[PDB]
Amino acid sequence: MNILLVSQCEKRALSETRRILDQFAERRGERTWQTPITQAGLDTLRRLLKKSARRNTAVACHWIRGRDHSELLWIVGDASRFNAQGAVPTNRTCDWHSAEDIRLLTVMAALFHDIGKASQAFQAKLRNRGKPMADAYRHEWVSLRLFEAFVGPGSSDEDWLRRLADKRETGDAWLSQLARDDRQSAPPGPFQKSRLPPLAQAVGWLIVSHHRLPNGDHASLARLPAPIQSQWCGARDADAKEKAACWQFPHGLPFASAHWRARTALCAQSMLERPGLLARGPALLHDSYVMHVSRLILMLADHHYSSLPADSRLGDPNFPLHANTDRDSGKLKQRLDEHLLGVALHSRKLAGTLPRLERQLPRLARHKGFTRRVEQPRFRWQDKAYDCAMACREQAMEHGFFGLNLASTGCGKTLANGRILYALADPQRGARFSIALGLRSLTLQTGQAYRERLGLGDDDLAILVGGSAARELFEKQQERLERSGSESAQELLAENSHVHFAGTLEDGPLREWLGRNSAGNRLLQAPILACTIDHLMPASESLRGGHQIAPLLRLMTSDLVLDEVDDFDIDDLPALSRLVHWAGLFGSRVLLSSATLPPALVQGLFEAYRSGREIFQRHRGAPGRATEIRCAWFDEFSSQSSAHGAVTSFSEAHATFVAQRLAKLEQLPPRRQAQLCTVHAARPALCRELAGQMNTWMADLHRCHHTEHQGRRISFGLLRLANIEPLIELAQAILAQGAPEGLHVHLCVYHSRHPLLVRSAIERQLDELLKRSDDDAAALFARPTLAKALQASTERDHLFVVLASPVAEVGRDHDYDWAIVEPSSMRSIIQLAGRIRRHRSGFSGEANLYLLSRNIRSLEGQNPAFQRPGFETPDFPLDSHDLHDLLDPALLARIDASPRIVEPFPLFPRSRLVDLEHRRLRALMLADDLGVPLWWQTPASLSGALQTSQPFRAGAKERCYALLPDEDDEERLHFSRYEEGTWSNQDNLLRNLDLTYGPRIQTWGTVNYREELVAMAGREDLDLRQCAMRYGEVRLRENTQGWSYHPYLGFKKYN
Amino acid sequence: KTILHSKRANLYYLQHCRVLVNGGRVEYVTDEGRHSHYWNIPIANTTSLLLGTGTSITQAAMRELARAGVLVGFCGGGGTPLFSANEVDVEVSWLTPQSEYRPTEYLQRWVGFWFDEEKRLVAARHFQRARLERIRHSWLEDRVLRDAGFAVDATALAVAVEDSARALEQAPNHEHLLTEEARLSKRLFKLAAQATRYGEFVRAKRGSGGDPANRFLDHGNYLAYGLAATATWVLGIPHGLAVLHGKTRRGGLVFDVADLIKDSLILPQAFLSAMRGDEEQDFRQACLDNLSRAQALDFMIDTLKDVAQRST
Amino acid sequence: KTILHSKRANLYYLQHCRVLVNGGRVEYVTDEGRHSHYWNIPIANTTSLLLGTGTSITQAAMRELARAGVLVGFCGGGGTPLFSANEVDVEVSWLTPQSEYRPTEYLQRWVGFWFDEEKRLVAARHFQRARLERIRHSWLEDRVLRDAGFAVDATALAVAVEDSARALEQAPNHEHLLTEEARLSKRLFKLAAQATRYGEFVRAKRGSGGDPANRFLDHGNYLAYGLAATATWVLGIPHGLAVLHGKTRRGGLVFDVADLIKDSLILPQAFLSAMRGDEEQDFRQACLDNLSRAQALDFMIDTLKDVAQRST
Amino acid sequence: ILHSKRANLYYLQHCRVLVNGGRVEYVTDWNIPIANTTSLLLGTGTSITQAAMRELARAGVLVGFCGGGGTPLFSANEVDVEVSWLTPQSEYRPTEYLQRWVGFWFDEEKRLVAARHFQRARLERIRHSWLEDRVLRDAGFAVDATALAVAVEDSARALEQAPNHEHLLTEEARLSKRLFKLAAQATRYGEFVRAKRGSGGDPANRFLDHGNYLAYGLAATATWVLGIPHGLAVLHGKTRRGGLVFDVADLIKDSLILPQAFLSAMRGDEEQDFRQACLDNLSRAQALDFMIDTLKDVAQRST
């Protein structure tokens, strides 16, 4: 093709644009290039231009499609310099309604945020190079107490402001008015009654929660922030001397410094000048949006300035106090006045920067794969969904969005979600959205699959690999961070987590605070992000640390997709509801993408989103807009859309759409038939019996369903087990049992306990071998991996079996011929049914799905039997654990989303499985007979009480392990353990496992750890040990005895 | 000096801009929030302008426009008429130049034959005979459309066109001619939807459609109207002297002239752009390319000349 | 980073210039009497360079050229070889990059099968079988050439190709294969002259022709040689390991590889450019367009791969 | 100028090669035997003209553009084959070493024999440079003499048997691992572990990588002079890109590059000074001539 490159770059961007384009093209004018090129070369040039692109970069590429018709191919950089057709102007000449209030509050809280570091105890601890001694009181608490002292009890919201606005004021007698929690009589909390005016209370909450949320104990929630007490924020049991030491100020608070007092007076006068500012006091205090945006700015500014080197250009040069000491040497680094002034300056700069984030951040525009119409009648709902989203674009932008992608599995919902959220965007600017998969850990294979399905490169889509990590270093690293005096120096995001992005990171708007190659900067600069919901949960469920900044900025600057959102455990639902509420709070548009969404969960999530959107509309946009959420419904058959301002009309619309979808679902031909199997009731015997039965069962299923070509019969099957240790035991039992009779069996073990690179390799092989279609035998038998395995043996019959944990239900597009499934929950049954013959058409009528009568946890005699995963609890018990009673027999004829989408009536919550699931979901999410709505009905967002009462991913405390090669010898591998930024050595906890092979049974779809490790290290151009520590983690529960490891079976717990 | 009006390639659809004269140049201004951008309009190569929603023009700019014979029309945004006078709609309010003095032969022929109803139905039949021929030509006997993904069922198109011609030959009056035109347009829509594997297409009226095909058809109607108005003004014939669409549409000669190319070049390109995921600008440029390559303006001029000559 | 060597579009023939590095950029300088003009060379998009009469290169420029895998050849001006060693002529003195490390499988296959005379005549026959197929393809079963004025007599081309293939099947040794290739080339020249109504064409040797067809053929031979040298270097096979033209030409594998596209794409374009009154630059650009559109470099690489694989 | 008189090669630096009067004359801002064996190697600040190339072409003079001092070899003319099957009619001198290299290469036994010969030559060079010549030691590279001899003897006693290419590779790796520690002890640089992929920041690692680059360039020059392609490796795997270059360079890699790198790290010299010292040492030991002779001997002693 012939392309024409035109550059509108300026200043430093022009030099780099010339340097890059002079190598790919010939000049035609002063800023015009032109060359013949190929598609691959054009993509290479575009990616090179996008990698090193500043804010001034502006390059347009034209193309000649049809005579007298040029076509703009793409624009790299600032797209405002060209019109839609790519022309240039002949001459250029010269909505936040609460930005100023947030800026003033943030600056004032920054000035008063570390005023408690003037304590003699804190100064001594900073200067104490010897053995560290834990401070009795947290510096935030004494800062708040000093604010209370300065403001004076009962003082009006104007008196203290005017007093601080008087520069000619050095009345340190206000220190005598201070209280002391160390002193007896239990002084009242600074928030109770009238100890603080309604505004100083807001500033005090900002001060006291600039390192951690005031999580305490215990109507109390609705009265926040009043019930905050000294015991709520830190505090330790110490002798009276230590407690008293935190209150004496020998060198005086930073009030004598001229610059500090001048800036404080300037801020106070600016606040007083503001019309009506001192009137919204109670409104601002309880406003989640204002408080949380102010706290984000304050915390990010503090995190940035706590790492900067000492500056003698601001603050008293010979001030006696100090704020922190450099961790490298321990010498004092920053004076308290300089620290406070810098934190305030950066707070003001960030408050100014934030409104520009909707135009300064990279976006994805002009994509044709999202607008191109389809040619096959199968994928013709992806166009109805796109048209429905485009019909709503303007109303969605004006009022909000709550979409529901209820299309059945195998229909290609990822491209549909991408197209919907791209349609909702303004065509001139582009789209920015996140894909939050409902998985515990995202492998690189799933991210690459997302890139392939959406047709996006790594210059447009980033992947946040790995999973979120619960606080482990909270005891060790926090000690050093507090000793150095900079407790806000921990990274905004975790350490092992890596963002796989290769796009514009040069001149990002938030480069100054986030960094340049830091994982927060890549997380924010990526137009489209592929992460997990556990990565975005720290936005709303972060109690101690700055983990809430990057997810929150992503939420404010992007849309949201919740893939497989119902896969979350029932106990983790309130966290998801909070996340949806905050997504609606900061202006994001949420699209739920699941095929088995029950009505109760959808209603609760919609209520959360509407509640958040009301407060967002109260702060951003034209005032007076009515909260009419533009709800939309998408499915494989049609797409609707309507506005709803209450959960009363949205429920009716959802019920109508569900009824229509069920009516259209009934007429579908059957492609899956389920048969109940009764099993004969420790591990080495039960697993052996199961392996004995699953020989005849697999033989019967293969005989019923298979593929025939040249007299050779191959069939792909799946066996899903609830837990991993029983899965490994059953794998051993099958392996040391052999083929049933002349039926050569290839087994693949796939669970979540393998090394992440190993797991990704297994997924890569299974996603390439299990892609099927109608009448594909000729290509199926010609596939290399299949070819070698078939030719090696002489048996005409082959059984390619996959033994998988519940990790194979999400993100796996596999077409099996048959499946043997243990019962955990109806959603699992539906998802695994949606995978046997999911790509092929034509059913023989014979049973292809086999369900065991009872799960392993019931054979062992444990009660409740449906738990982890499951819904059965002692509070909601089941009268039976046999599938012959919990399931309606009419369901086995045709299994689809119908039992899950609709709510049966009357509810029998102790005899039917789906009835139990619906009863629990409607009991927790809505109400029925510590409620979720308290997150937005009461000011509970001001404390971490809800996050502790209803925790997320609670229970097991996993530890990170890896098979790290020895530093001296690469061949030798060591079982390590991430303890605190340092991989210890734990060879004593690992032992080899011996596997016995029966007649005619080998293993397929496996990988060697060493070969995969070296291959991925070479691919990523990283050190081999660094690659092992970055992408080879395994999370295992702490066991005293240890584990037994085999490459084909993963780590099995040993006792 | 400017190009001959029949040899001009550009056509401009403008929105949310301010058309004015800046330093002797006709330019339109778009507000970029903190800046105003001035974009030049090549008046010496533009047949006509179309000012959509949120546009405005000044007397100086309109004077320089009506000095190179550039027509100006006030259309409506999103494929919507200017307004809807009860049961009828007007799409473009044309501002034809009046200082330019146009040829005075075709106008005399038109006014001479126009006031006889039989001689005006003869003209409508001759107008439809060229529309059918050009439909046949473009859809079948030209390769450019086929090489871009248009694969029409030759037999079905042939039988449809033959039936339309047979109905035309036995047309008693204007109403049956209009009914036959509507039937042919609907069958052509179905055939074009099938040819580009577009799926199931149902034509929406008054710009109420949501699928790309309906929007692109409604947009391309404006380009057809602009070219037809240019041709009628160039020949000196007033817009009001219609032969077919004079019963319900003001300035019906524009619609009658535009019908010649509406179903032969706009229709395939609408579906081709829809299948390709094109935006409105890309579809507009593709349609302009199709019209310039096929010399649609010259065809309109020659057809008007032939009808006027055969009228005598 | 630079484009893959098989996905590069440009090719440069330079004359009366000075190739040097100016500010980190590879550029050539032309003296305009009172000024010197520096022109940039897109090394990241150029397959190879050709330096004709009055050129010169420096060590820095050659270092930057042999770092993106850009081959450099010293041809002769006016379609003339570099020199003539008595009865044989050498046209290009190739400077293949040596710091780049090339794949090591096809080279082993070539060196394994290359030293057997029978196994090397089998390779020559397989090379000619692809040349005939591509001649057929380009001349007959492609419309781009026909839409540009190339109207070959289908029956005559078919019978000529059939006779050439029949002679190939009964080839006893290399000499008869060369004779058959020469006969086919002469008959193809006659057919191409007739097809473009060029008149009476008689092929001139050693760049002695005066009519545009002879000059354009002599020039396009250089583009074919450049592409063939690029392909052979990319696969890692040395230029010297020839299969057909090793008896009289140094680095004969380049000529053997270039023969695949010399008679199928260069030949029609030479007469098309002559008939159009093109200069050498226009013919060069047209030939580069033809090669890029037909993916000639990919065809050469794939044919070399197929010959190497079938050799085993 | 005569880089390798055993192969008749010449190095031209800071001069413009042009033709005036029908004879090439190198007008520096020289009397060279222009014949079938001339093989010029243009260097820094040298420019050639088309007429110069023509007159160097009708003389059999292969021309290559090498870096500063001789390495790396950016691009060079391609050597032809003297096989009787082909009939190259020119003033060139086609080589006949590719024929023997192909004739012995495909049999794994002779390949292994040649690889063991390579390793023997490598070890002999180590023992000669480290012990027999004290110039490096006198320069400040005092060694543990006996320890180096013991290590060389162990390496030879391991390489003299244990067939299979992986065994030879493991033996070479062990020899290099011991040799690096011995050199570190000799120069007293302290503890040092080589950083693979050239990611080290210590002076030793970067100097070692620079020396690796120089040796690879020299090996490319030697193979181009002989005419053997880089693919036909003898030590490395058949799938390793440029295996023969690495195998040839390994002969002089550990013998010369390691001591000079450690001494330059001790002295704290700049990268340019270290590179100049390396080039001077390589010139002293006739490294290029040694690699050419070793390849020729390996080819001849396997027929």
PDB file of C-alpha atoms in Angstrom, chain C residues 231-288:
ATOM      1  CA  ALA C 231      15.975 -13.654  -0.436  1.00  0.00           C
ATOM      2  CA  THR C 232      19.080 -15.844  -0.631  1.00  0.00           C
ATOM      3  CA  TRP C 233      20.803 -13.887   2.135  1.00  0.00           C
ATOM      4  CA  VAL C 234      17.671 -14.006   4.303  1.00  0.00           C
ATOM      5  CA  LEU C 235      17.483 -17.789   4.061  1.00  0.00           C
ATOM      6  CA  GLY C 236      21.209 -17.963   4.861  1.00  0.00           C
ATOM      7  CA  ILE C 237      22.160 -19.708   1.607  1.00  0.00           C
ATOM      8  CA  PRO C 238      25.367 -18.360   0.011  1.00  0.00           C
ATOM      9  CA  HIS C 239      25.064 -16.701  -3.382  1.00  0.00           C
ATOM     10  CA  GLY C 240      27.625 -19.073  -4.884  1.00  0.00           C
ATOM     11  CA  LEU C 241      25.596 -22.274  -4.474  1.00  0.00           C
ATOM     12  CA  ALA C 242      23.852 -22.165  -7.851  1.00  0.00           C
ATOM     13  CA  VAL C 243      21.746 -24.924  -9.378  1.00  0.00           C
ATOM     14  CA  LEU C 244      21.352 -23.718 -12.967  1.00  0.00           C
ATOM     15  CA  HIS C 245      23.412 -20.583 -13.711  1.00  0.00           C
ATOM     16  CA  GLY C 246      26.677 -21.679 -12.152  1.00  0.00           C
ATOM     17  CA  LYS C 247      28.557 -22.425 -15.353  1.00  0.00           C
ATOM     18  CA  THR C 248      29.171 -18.818 -16.416  1.00  0.00           C
ATOM     19  CA  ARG C 249      27.960 -16.450 -13.660  1.00  0.00           C
ATOM     20  CA  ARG C 250      29.582 -15.805 -10.288  1.00  0.00           C
ATOM     21  CA  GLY C 251      27.031 -15.943  -7.498  1.00  0.00           C
ATOM     22  CA  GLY C 252      24.638 -17.831  -9.740  1.00  0.00           C
ATOM     23  CA  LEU C 253      22.003 -18.593  -7.116  1.00  0.00           C
ATOM     24  CA  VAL C 254      20.964 -14.937  -7.354  1.00  0.00           C
ATOM     25  CA  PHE C 255      20.271 -15.291 -11.077  1.00  0.00           C
ATOM     26  CA  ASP C 256      18.520 -18.636 -10.604  1.00  0.00           C
ATOM     27  CA  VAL C 257      16.218 -17.152  -7.958  1.00  0.00           C
ATOM     28  CA  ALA C 258      15.602 -13.998 -10.010  1.00  0.00           C
ATOM     29  CA  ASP C 259      14.560 -16.037 -13.054  1.00  0.00           C
ATOM     30  CA  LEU C 260      11.358 -16.947 -11.197  1.00  0.00           C
ATOM     31  CA  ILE C 261      10.013 -13.385 -11.455  1.00  0.00           C
ATOM     32  CA  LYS C 262      12.050 -11.994 -14.365  1.00  0.00           C
ATOM     33  CA  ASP C 263       9.736 -13.325 -17.090  1.00  0.00           C
ATOM     34  CA  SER C 264       6.449 -13.049 -15.169  1.00  0.00           C
ATOM     35  CA  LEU C 265       6.448  -9.521 -13.707  1.00  0.00           C
ATOM     36  CA  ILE C 266       9.369  -7.576 -15.192  1.00  0.00           C
ATOM     37  CA  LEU C 267       8.552  -8.514 -18.788  1.00  0.00           C
ATOM     38  CA  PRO C 268       4.937  -7.236 -19.065  1.00  0.00           C
ATOM     39  CA  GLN C 269       5.791  -4.096 -17.104  1.00  0.00           C
ATOM     40  CA  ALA C 270       8.712  -3.249 -19.396  1.00  0.00           C
ATOM     41  CA  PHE C 271       6.471  -3.084 -22.461  1.00  0.00           C
ATOM     42  CA  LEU C 272       3.643  -1.418 -20.530  1.00  0.00           C
ATOM     43  CA  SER C 273       6.012   1.355 -19.429  1.00  0.00           C
ATOM     44  CA  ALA C 274       7.553   1.687 -22.891  1.00  0.00           C
ATOM     45  CA  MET C 275       4.106   2.042 -24.464  1.00  0.00           C
ATOM     46  CA  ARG C 276       3.209   4.711 -21.890  1.00  0.00           C
ATOM     47  CA  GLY C 277       6.241   6.916 -22.536  1.00  0.00           C
ATOM     48  CA  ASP C 278       7.728   6.298 -19.092  1.00  0.00           C
ATOM     49  CA  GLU C 279      11.189   7.306 -17.950  1.00  0.00           C
ATOM     50  CA  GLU C 280      13.451   4.936 -16.028  1.00  0.00           C
ATOM     51  CA  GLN C 281      12.269   6.151 -12.612  1.00  0.00           C
ATOM     52  CA  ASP C 282       8.606   5.591 -13.486  1.00  0.00           C
ATOM     53  CA  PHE C 283       9.344   2.106 -14.816  1.00  0.00           C
ATOM     54  CA  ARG C 284      11.334   1.314 -11.671  1.00  0.00           C
ATOM     55  CA  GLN C 285       8.466   2.428  -9.440  1.00  0.00           C
ATOM     56  CA  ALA C 286       5.956   0.457 -11.520  1.00  0.00           C
ATOM     57  CA  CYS C 287       8.122  -2.663 -11.273  1.00  0.00           C
ATOM     58  CA  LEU C 288       8.489  -2.232  -7.514  1.00  0.00           C
TER      59      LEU C 288
END
